[PDB]
Amino acid sequence: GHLLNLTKPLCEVNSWHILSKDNAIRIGEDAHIIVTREPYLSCDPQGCRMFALSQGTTLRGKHANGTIHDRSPFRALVSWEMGQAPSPYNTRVECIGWSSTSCHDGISRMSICISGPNNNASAVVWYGGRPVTEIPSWAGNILRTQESECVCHGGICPVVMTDGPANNRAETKIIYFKEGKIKKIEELKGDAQHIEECSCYGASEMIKCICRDNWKGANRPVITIDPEMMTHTSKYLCSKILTDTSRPNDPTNGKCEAPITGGSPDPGVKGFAFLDGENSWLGRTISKDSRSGYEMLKVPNAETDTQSGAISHQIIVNNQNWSGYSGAFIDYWANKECFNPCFYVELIRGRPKESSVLWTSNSIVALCGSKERLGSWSWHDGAEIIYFK
Amino acid sequence: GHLLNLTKPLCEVNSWHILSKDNAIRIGEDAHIIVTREPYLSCDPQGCRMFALSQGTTLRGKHANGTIHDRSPFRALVSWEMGQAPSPYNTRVECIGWSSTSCHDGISRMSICISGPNNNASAVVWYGGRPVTEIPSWAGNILRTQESECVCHGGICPVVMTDGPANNRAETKIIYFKEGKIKKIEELKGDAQHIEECSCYGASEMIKCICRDNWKGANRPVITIDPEMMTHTSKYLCSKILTDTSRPNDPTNGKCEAPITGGSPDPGVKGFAFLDGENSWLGRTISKDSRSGYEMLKVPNAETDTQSGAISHQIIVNNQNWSGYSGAFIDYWANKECFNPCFYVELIRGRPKESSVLWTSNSIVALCGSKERLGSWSWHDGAEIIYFK
Amino acid sequence: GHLLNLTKPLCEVNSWHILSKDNAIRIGEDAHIIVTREPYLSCDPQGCRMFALSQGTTLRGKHANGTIHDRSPFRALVSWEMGQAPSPYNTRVECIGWSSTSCHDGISRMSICISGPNNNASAVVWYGGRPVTEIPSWAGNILRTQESECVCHGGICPVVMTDGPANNRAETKIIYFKEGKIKKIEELKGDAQHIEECSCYGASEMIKCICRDNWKGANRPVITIDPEMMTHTSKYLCSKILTDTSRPNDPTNGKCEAPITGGSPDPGVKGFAFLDGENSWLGRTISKDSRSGYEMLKVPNAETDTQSGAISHQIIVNNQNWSGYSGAFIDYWANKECFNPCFYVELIRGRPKESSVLWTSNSIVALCGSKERLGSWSWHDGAEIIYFK
Amino acid sequence: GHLLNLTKPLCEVNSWHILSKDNAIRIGEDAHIIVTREPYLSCDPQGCRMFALSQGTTLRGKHANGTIHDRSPFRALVSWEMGQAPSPYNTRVECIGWSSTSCHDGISRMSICISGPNNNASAVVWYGGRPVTEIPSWAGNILRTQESECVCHGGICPVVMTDGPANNRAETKIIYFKEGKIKKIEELKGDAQHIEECSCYGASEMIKCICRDNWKGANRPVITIDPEMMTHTSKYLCSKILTDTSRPNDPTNGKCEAPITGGSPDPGVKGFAFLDGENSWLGRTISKDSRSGYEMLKVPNAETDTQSGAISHQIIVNNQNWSGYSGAFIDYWANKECFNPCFYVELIRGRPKESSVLWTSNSIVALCGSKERLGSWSWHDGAEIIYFK
Ligand SMILES: *[C@@H]1O[C@H](CO)[C@@H](O)[C@H](O)[C@H]1NC(C)=O
Ligand SMILES: *[C@@H]1O[C@H](CO)[C@@H](O)[C@H](O)[C@H]1NC(C)=O
Ligand SMILES: *[C@@H]1O[C@H](CO)[C@@H](O)[C@H](O)[C@H]1NC(C)=O
Ligand SMILES: *[C@@H]1O[C@H](CO)[C@@H](O)[C@H](O)[C@H]1NC(C)=O
Ligand SMILES: *[C@@H]1O[C@H](CO)[C@@H](O)[C@H](O)[C@H]1NC(C)=O
Ligand SMILES: *[C@@H]1O[C@H](CO)[C@@H](O)[C@H](O)[C@H]1NC(C)=O
Ligand SMILES: *[C@@H]1O[C@H](CO)[C@@H](O)[C@H](O)[C@H]1NC(C)=O
Ligand SMILES: *[C@@H]1O[C@H](CO)[C@@H](O)[C@H](O)[C@H]1NC(C)=O
Ligand SMILES: [Ca+2]
Ligand SMILES: [Ca+2]
Ligand SMILES: [Ca+2]
Ligand SMILES: [Ca+2]
Known part of the structure; x- marks a missing residue:
């Protein structure tokens, strides 16, 4: 192949169309589907794949008991063909660990997994399917990375x-x-x-x-990064539309240069946004307290305008269903003259919110931008928790 | 590859030979087979694949309960190697939705899936494995397409x-x-x-x-379509041999320019015919009322002659067994000087005709034309519903 | 590729070494393994595969009940990677039917399957993955072919x-x-x-x-076939070492030009021999009555000498274990200056000899010649029928 | 490809990073995982694979009963993609037998399996996926080889x-x-x-x-082997740090030219070391008696100095957990100017140490060298034996 250069601008987005959905918990009620969490997607010139951190057990297996816990020696980053559910039979082990990132540079994939004890973890950086670099913890307290x-x-x-x-x-x-x-x-x-x-x-x-x-x-x-100069700057998203979970109500003015405090009971969730002047979209959970629901809001100049508000809205997962982590990805190798924004939502099932089962796992839904104004409906997980009792 | 041009005529057909049969419900009694309906086949230069709309569950799984229902966020168009049964392990997700079509242009495959709410569905058109176009509902009432x-x-x-x-x-x-x-x-x-x-x-x-x-x-x-001029015309199959379900008895004269009404209790079923002057074949269910049985009737000039009748007859599924949708496909890349007609029959099991189970699914049988006069037998599904009680 | 020409002689064979064994019934006690019978192997330039006639059900499935029966619309010729057990997940459907043969001509594989009712069956001949020829029954009574x-x-x-x-x-x-x-x-x-x-x-x-x-x-x-002249001759194997089952005791003289009658209770079993003058080997069941045991006997000039006896002997399956059909294959694309003989034995389990279960299936063992005088042991199926009760 | 030449020296190693872990016993509690033992890894120009000797049954199957036994006709050398657990669906049969080795020469893989009765076993040597050589037992008492x-x-x-x-x-x-x-x-x-x-x-x-x-x-x-001159020499590891199991306490001086006796109750376990002057690393079980725990010790000049001791330690499996066989492998095709040491530990579960179950099997963990000083934790099997009772 040839190296990916980010030469294209972002595509105009007016709504979001369905890309993939794995229905992993529905299927996993009776097929051999592995327990996961912290999923994402990543593309390469040949196609897009799903990724997640395995817990080293199937969903119906007795070892699903105790999978609320985030870090163990039995976790691995695995990837699989987009849309399939993850099983022991269709998954590729990228690296071993409990925090990960992965991306393809046009020629080969880089995957990184961090493992080890909380006070002395280490990243192992893989490229082209081999390990090539190792990075010791610098602060002795849960070295960790992007999860997308x-x-x-x-x-x-x-x-x-x-x-x-x-x-x-x-x-x-x-x-x-x-x-x-x-x-x-x-x-x-x-x-x-x-x-x-x-x-x-x-x-x-x-x-x-x-x-x-x-x-x-x-x-x-x-964080804004210039990959050719290898420098960065950081600030906060300026918009008054707050997108962490938990969060307080949206205030009248956001803040560019400092945090806006508030919210109960949780300090945060992984999320994302696309920031492109007028063509800006913020994702967030619908609930301000819990990882429930998911919505997309079009917020022109969200990055720079503290009074910027929403001019359009799409519910991705209704607020009667659990969401979870969300993140950005793009098919940088599509046959389009612009890069089209995509995102996934992790649909977490089981503990702590559904304490009638002993496990925690998830399924995935992913969507990409459309220039059309498409109708929409909720893409919730779809499994019946009663079936697992 | 090279673009497919439809340069060949249809092959002479005097009977039908067996091409494939997946036995999916028999196998799915105990293996991990996904619930489907609306199946078909489609070929490309490298081979032929089975396609169908998943329900996002296995046949023996508890989520099989309720699969009589046609539209949900848990359905997708999946494809798999011809002759295998569809499992979570051997299926490729083509796109997400509850109505589909797919075809190969000699270079890449186009797959279209429609999803969303009945009043605001949308098609996403995939080409070469990527999404490329989106089409919103124009009439707000279950946007839908070919299912073959x-x-x-x-x-x-x-x-x-x-x-x-x-x-x-x-x-x-x-x-x-x-x-x-x-x-x-x-x-x-x-x-x-x-x-x-x-x-x-x-x-x-x-x-x-x-x-x-x-x-x-x-x-x-x-509908007769000229693909180079991008124009079409439409009428009705002229023959007195009626081939929808439900239908009345075959009248003395068919109608070219208007519907022949009648039949009870169902308004329609997907079906097909090959219309080629003397070389014309009509499929239909054997029962005039129900989706039971399946037969091919050779009806010369069916397309144009309101008095045309059958000169030959092959039973594909006997009338003590359930059939379902039926549709046309051809291997356009075969090593023959003519395009040989093929078709499939959907063999529906479970609800509503078999109410002792909570689910609805199908297997598939597919046949292609022969110039020989072959013997034949019934290619019914073969599962024992008592085993599922 | 390039066409296979049979330019090489047979390798000298002094004993037989283990090639492959799939342990299908052992594995199939708990995994999703399909029911089969009439297996064989066939190679191509890229490798060797296992083949068999599926019954369209898994072994543990309720549809394994009744699989003693030979012909149904649910049977197919399937192939899989040599050594694996056949499942719904690793098998390729070659053609649909209940009698088959297959071979590779150096460029593509020809596979033939016969299906239909006993009085009007038909062969469909596939080449390169596509059906190309159909042959109707010429005598109306179970048209059938080699099963290797x-x-x-x-x-x-x-x-x-x-x-x-x-x-x-x-x-x-x-x-x-x-x-x-x-x-x-x-x-x-x-x-x-x-x-x-x-x-x-x-x-x-x-x-x-x-x-x-x-x-x-x-x-x-x-039958001796000249493929370039497309002519044949036929006789009987001359040796007194009789190799059908059932059979009487070996007589003082065999017969070249007529059948030797006798034996009880069964009329025949599929088998094989390699006939190469001094370098000749005959396979047979150890039991003269039943499909039990399997042995190889080196019988110099078996083809032409009515008084030829065995000069060496290898037990392949001991007579306390069930055998079944046996057949010849060769890796004609090996990197050797001679063609080395191989064979398989079908290890039949279940009905009729093991009536505590409702099914009939088999596993496979395959061996090839060695010029060495290798030690040997029994390669019987290995499953415990008590586990299936 | 091109023939591999060992032109590179060993990489500097100061600690060990996680390469792969298959969690086979955790997963196999509920998915279709084959029973194995004697695992290893081996690479080729396209990647690294796991290898082991199957027992011809799944872990949960009733035929898992009795798998403490080492030799049967139902074992085979199988390989699979590194990191997956071994199932009937993802495993390649390399050869048939109960003792093996395998390696890639840059062009093709050589795999060797020994099978047969204890008094008359034979090796079948496969190259490029075909059998090419057979070797009969020379001493009639369990012909056997490396198991890595x-x-x-x-x-x-x-x-x-x-x-x-x-x-x-x-x-x-x-x-x-x-x-x-x-x-x-x-x-x-x-x-x-x-x-x-x-x-x-x-x-x-x-x-x-x-x-x-x-x-x-x-x-x-x-054993020190010169592959170009095809000669060897042999001695003992000089270091006082003893690494067989069972073993006595480390003495004040090791021995180069003679065995050090002692230890109870077992005579040995497969193990490994990397011997490269100052850059020398020895693995061993933590327990001196039993196959429990596993540790790496950096022991300069272990090969030549009878008073050499450890200058650094890393625990790989803590001593509250079962280990097993351990062995060396290297990715000779890595993009480094040195060959980096890797090793695996077999994590044996079930009999004889865990007699509440009827089976013996294992999972695998593998690690490679790092020049960093990485933190570490225990990579034990992780299955709960109570779940199998
Ligand atoms: C991207 O730019 C690099 C130079 O920075 C160049 O070598 C490479 O060919 C470019 N990739 C493509 C696809 O043009
Ligand atoms: C789940 O794990 C907990 C904690 O290890 C244990 O106490 C409990 O018995 C387990 N429950 C089941 C159903 O296995
Ligand atoms: C079909 O026609 C197209 C366009 O007219 C041409 O580009 C193509 O090569 C033709 N296909 C073949 C197989 O010749
Ligand atoms: C099937 O679904 C219905 C409707 O939700 C539910 O009430 C019923 O209990 C389900 N049956 C089973 C056996 O799960
Ligand atoms: C075998 O002979 C055929 C026809 O006689 C010839 O065309 C072909 O080139 C030969 N194949 C090989 C591999 O030499
Ligand atoms: C097996 O099949 C026979 C014949 O159809 C039937 O009578 C019997 O009920 C079946 N047994 C089981 C256990 O399904
Ligand atoms: C290794 O040496 C062999 C023979 O000495 C040579 O033919 C081969 O090309 C060498 N390998 C490489 C990768 O240079
Ligand atoms: C396990 O195998 C032993 C040895 O043959 C046998 O005695 C015992 O019955 C078996 N146990 C089970 C539960 O199958
Ligand atoms: Ca926060
Ligand atoms: Ca109608
Ligand atoms: Ca006979
Ligand atoms: Ca020892």
Whole structure:
């Protein structure tokens, strides 16, 4: 192949069309489907795949008991053909661990998995199916990364990683990879106070990462990365439309340079947005408290305008159904003259919200932009929890 | 590859030989087989595949309960290697939705899935494995399409779609795609009064679609499409041999220009015919009332002669067994100097005819033409419903 | 590719080494393994595959009940990667039917399946994955063919087919195929009185088929086919070592030109031999009455010497275990200067010999020649029938 | 491809990073996973695969009963994509038997399986997927080989095999293969007193095999092989750090030229080391008595210095968990200027240590060297044996 260069702008988006849905929990009620969480999608020149962190057991298996827990030696990053549900028979092991990112540079895939004990974790960086670089924890407190795809440009693939408290100031770094080797590392700079779980996309030779502040803000940090110069800046999303969970009600003015506090009971969830002037879209859970529902809001100049509000709206998952993490991806190899925004929603089933079962797992739904004004309906998980009792 | 051009005539057919049978319900009694309905086949230069609309569950799974229902967020168009039964392990997700068509232009496959709410559904058109076009509902009442393969000629792949009432006049359009993009759209014209579920095939640079009139006629509408001029005409199958279900008795004279009414209790079923002067074959269910049995009748000049009758007869599924939808396909890439007709029959098991189970699904049988005079037997589903009680 | 020509002689064989074993019944006690019978193997330039006639159900499925029966619309020829057990997930459907043969001509595979009712069955001949020729029953009584591989030479692949009584004179024909088209058909001629289930191999531009006389002989018929001249002759295997089942004791003299009668209670079983002068090997069941045990006997000049006996002996399946059909195959594309003989044994389990279960199925073992004098042990099926009760 | 030449030295190793983990026993509690033991890994130019000896049954199947037994006609060497668990659906049968080795020469894979009765076993040597050579037992007492990968150089792939007593002097040979054909055979020479189960790796045009003395020594034999001259020498690992199991306490001085006796109750376990001057690493079970736990010890000049001790430690499996066999492999086709050491640990579950179940099987974990000083945690099997009772 040839290296991906982010030469195209973003496509105009007026609504979202269905891309894929795996129905993994419905199917997994009776087929051999593995337990997962923290899914995402990532494309390459030959097609798009689903990704997630396995828990090393099937959904109906006795080892599904206790899968609310996030980190163990039995987790792995696995990928599979888009739309299928993940089984022990159709999944490729990308790397071993409990926090991950992956992206394709046009020639080969880079996958990163972090594993080990909380006080001394390590990333193993794979390129082209081999391991090539290892990175020790720098702060001794749950070294962790994006939980969705990275983005490459001219062979440089920046990745955002954090080590340190989840509830206080941490140590975040931007690592610039080439063939899975470190070309440059930067300490986080700018106004973002805390960085977790960045959802990133590229357009017009720049990468934007929309992340989770788990310490203070209900507004999301935004890291802007120049992959050719290998530099970054950070701020908060300016818009008054708040998109973390938990969050307070939308205030009259957002904040660019500082967190907006508030919300109960949880400090954060992975999410995303596409920031392109008038062509800007913010995703968020419908509930301001819980990971329930999911909606897309078109918010012109969300990135720069503190009073920017929504001019259009699409419900992706109604508020009577559980959502979860969400993130950005793009098919950078599509036959279009612009890069078309896509996103996924993790549809979490089981604990803590559904305590009648002993497990936690998820299914996936993914959508991409349309220039049309399409009708829509809810793409919820669809499984009956009673069937699992 | 190279673009398919429909340069060949149809082959002479004197009987039908067995092509494939998946035995899906027998196998699915104990293996992990997904619930489907609305199956078909479609070929490409490398081989032929089975296609159908999944229900997002396995046959033995608890979520099989309730699958009589036609439209949900859990359905998708899936394809698999011809002859296998469809499982979560061997199926490719073509697109997401509850009404579909698919065809190959010699270079790439186009697959179309319609999804969303009845009052605001949308088609997503995929080409080469990517989404390329979206079409919103134009009449706000269950946007829907062929449920068997489309046909391509010189890169133009016409598709018949309907939006509007199932029991009254609707809005049908002929959409001419190239690389999944719309080149032309036409409103239905001609004598056909209602168009559903067209079964199409190509020969000598023309495409014929034999459809289902769900409003009035027990004779089938025929849409004739010229793919290079991107124009069409429509009328009814002239023959007194009536081939919808339900239908009345075959009258003394058919009708070319109007529906022949009658039949109880059902308004229609998807079906097909091959219309080629003396070399013409009509399929229909054996029962005039119910989707039971299936027979092929050789009816010379069926397309044009209101007094045409059967000169030969093959029972495909005996009338002590359930059939279902039926449709046309051809392997346009065969090593023959003519295009040989093929068809499938959907073998529906479970509800509503078999109410001892909670689910509805099917298996598939497919046959192609022979110039020989072959013996034959019934190719029914073969599952024992008592085993599922 | 390039056409296979039978330019090499047979390899010297002094003992037999293990090639493959699928353990299908053992595995199928808990995994999704399909019920089969009449297995065989066949190679192509890329590798060797296993083949068999499916019954359209898994072994543990309720539809395994009644699989003692030989002919149904639910049977298919399937192939899979050598050594795996056949499941709904790893098997390729070659053609649909209840009697089959298949061979690769160096460029593409020809597969033939016969289906239909006993009085009007038909063969469908596939080449390169596509059906190309159909053959109607010529005698109205179970048209049937080899149940192991055919052999090709310079693009010509002869096949032996029989139509007519199983217990009286029948009508056998040798059909010479090219790209699955009939180039020539001959009626059986020579001294063989009844021909079933031929096991064929090629060497030095000639093909030999060792068959089953189900009418009279306990000695096996041998059809010698010249593929370039498209002619054949037939006789009986001359040796006194009788190799049908059931059979009487080996007499002081065999017969070349007529059947040796005797044996109780069964009229025949599919089997094979390699006939190469001093380098000749005969397979047979160990039991003279039942399909129990399996042994190889080196019988120099078996083909021509009525007094030939065994000079060496290898037990393949001990006589405390069930065997079944057996047949010849060769990897004609190996990197050797001679063609090495291989064979398989079908290890039949269930009915009629094991009536505590409701099903009949088999596993497979395959071996090839060695010039070494290797040690050996029994390669019996290995499943515990008590586990299935 | 091109022949692999061992032109590179070993990479510097200061700690070990996780490469793969299949979690086979956790998954196999409910999915169709085959029972195995004696696993390893081996790479080729396209990637790395897991290998092991199947027992011809699934873990949950009733035929899992009795799998503590090591040799049967139902075992085979199978391979699968690294990281997946082994099922009947994702495994390639390499050859049939109960002792194996496999390695890739840059062009094709050589796989060797031994089968047959204890007094008359035979090796079948496969190359490029075909059988090419057979080797009869030379001493009539359990002909057996490495149970981990061989190593190739310039098309020569030496393999160590033993025939004879497990508890007294045996007859070991070094067999030099090229395209699976024997180029040279040597009787074992040098100071090693008993050789089993060698773990081999290549560097700087030489091969080192670290084996198991089952007769006398708790120190491990080391065979040094020159693949281009096709010669070898043998001695013992000099270091006082003893790495067989069972073993006594580490003494003040090791022994180069003789076994160190002692230890209770078991005579040996397969193991490995990387011997590269200062860059030397030894693995062993943590327990001196039992196959429990696993640790890596960096022991400079372990190969030459009888007083060499550990300068660094990493626990791979804690001593509250079962281990098993362990062995060396390297991705010789990696994009590095050195060959990086890797190893696996077999994690044995069930009998004899866990007698609440009727079966014996394992999962696998594999790690490779890092120049970093990484943190670490235990990579134990992770299955709950209570779930299987
Ligand atoms: C992207 O740019 C790089 C130089 O930075 C170039 O080598 C590569 O060919 C480009 N990729 C394509 C697809 O043009
Ligand atoms: C689930 O795991 C918990 C904690 O390890 C244990 O106490 C409980 O018995 C398990 N429950 C089941 C149903 O296996
Ligand atoms: C079919 O016609 C198209 C366009 O007219 C041409 O480009 C193509 O090569 C033709 N196909 C073949 C197989 O010749
Ligand atoms: C089937 O679905 C109906 C409707 O939701 C439900 O009430 C019923 O209990 C279900 N039956 C079973 C056996 O799950
Ligand atoms: C075999 O002979 C055929 C026809 O006699 C010839 O065309 C072909 O080239 C030969 N095949 C090989 C592999 O030499
Ligand atoms: C097996 O099939 C026979 C014959 O159809 C039937 O009478 C019997 O009920 C079946 N047994 C089981 C256990 O399904
Ligand atoms: C390894 O050496 C062999 C023979 O000495 C040579 O033919 C081969 O090309 C070499 N391999 C590479 C990758 O250069
Ligand atoms: C396990 O196998 C043993 C040995 O043959 C047998 O005695 C026992 O009955 C078997 N147990 C089960 C539960 O099948
Ligand atoms: Ca927050
Ligand atoms: Ca009608
Ligand atoms: Ca006989
Ligand atoms: Ca020892």
